[PDB]
Design a protein around this ligand. Structure first.
Ligand SMILES: Nc1nc2c(ncn2[C@@H]2O[C@H](COP(=O)(O)OP(=O)(O)OP(=O)(O)O)[C@@H](O)[C@H]2O)c(=O)[nH]1
Ligand SMILES: [Ca+2]
Ligand SMILES: [Mg+2]
Lengths: 77, 167
């Protein structure tokens, strides 16, 4: 399954499909738009399970296929 | 303020997402992008009272049906949506309601039957009375026809569920 679960502001969440070639910004565009969120005003983090929920910041232009199976969190800047 | 966990259920393409996004963001989603898992939250004034709504928008088609059991347990109120332009979606609701009752074991669960896409009158293949009869058959369960496109009875679906919840 080529999906990524993403925790969003205001205790919301979404699971998006990842198709090869898409950047992180691409896979999350619609989910952010329908919630009135703007990527330029947010930071996206990768949750590090092996280190007790520690967050690691990612670039919005990251290749999405490389994040399949990862759980992310979007916070406001 | 008290929080309400609402769950939108139904087969694929009926407009569960369109209804939800219309309610939360006030915009109409014209394209059909199948839902996997989505939750929204909206602060709303119901009966002159501040309420926090957490709406779980579900996938019309689940590979593993057992996943539905998980969100039905947590759900307080349920919206069963079908499209008036697709008979199969109306017939699929019987199994869904029974699954909801099987999870809680109580024949009493706050819910609302929604016949969506009522703006497509020319393509109607499910009658209004037909839907009203099913609701009546479901112990006088609430019922209404809506349109995510024309903004008809959108807010009502959610406002009514809240009313049922505060018993
Ligand atoms: N004309 C009209 N189209 C609608 C209405 N509600 C939804 N649609 C359209 O019906 C199609 C599917 O809408 P969705 O909201 O994605 O339906 P869905 O139930 O969420 O489908 P899944 O997530 O796959 O289970 C889209 O192309 C919408 O634009 C409505 O009230 N009227
Ligand atoms: Ca993981
Ligand atoms: Mg959907």
């Amino acid at each position: 399954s080529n999906t990524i679960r993403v925790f969003l502001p205001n205790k919301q969440r979404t699971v998006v499909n990842v198709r090869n070639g898409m950047s992180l910004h691409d896979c999350l565009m619609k989910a952010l738009k329908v919630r009135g969120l703007q990527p330029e005003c947010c930071a996206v983090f990768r949750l590090l399970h092996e280190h007790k929920g520690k967050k690691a910041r990612l670039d919005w232009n990251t290749d999405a296929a490389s994040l399949i199976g990862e759980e992310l969190q979007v916070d406001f800047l | 303020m008290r929080e309400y966990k609402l769950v939108v259920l139904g087969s694929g393409g009926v407009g569960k997402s369109a209804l939800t996004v219309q309610f939360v963001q006030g915009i109409f989603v014209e394209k059909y992008d199948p839902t996997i898992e989505d939750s929204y939250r909206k602060q709303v004034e119901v009966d002159c009272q501040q309420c926090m709504l957490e709406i779980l928008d579900t996938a019309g088609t689940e590979q593993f049906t057992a996943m539905r059991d998980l969100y039905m347990k947590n759900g307080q109120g349920f919206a069963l949506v079908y499209s008036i332009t697709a008979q199969s979606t109306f017939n699929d609701l019987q199994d869904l309601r029974e699954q909801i009752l099987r999870v809680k074991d109580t024949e009493d669960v706050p819910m609302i039957l929604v016949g969506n896409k009522c703006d497509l009158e020319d393509e109607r293949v499910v009658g209004k009375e037909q839907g009203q009869n099913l609701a009546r058959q479901w112990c006088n369960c609430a019922f209404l026809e809506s349109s995510a496109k024309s903004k008809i009875n959108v807010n009502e679906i959610f406002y009514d569920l809240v009313r049922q919840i505060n018993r």
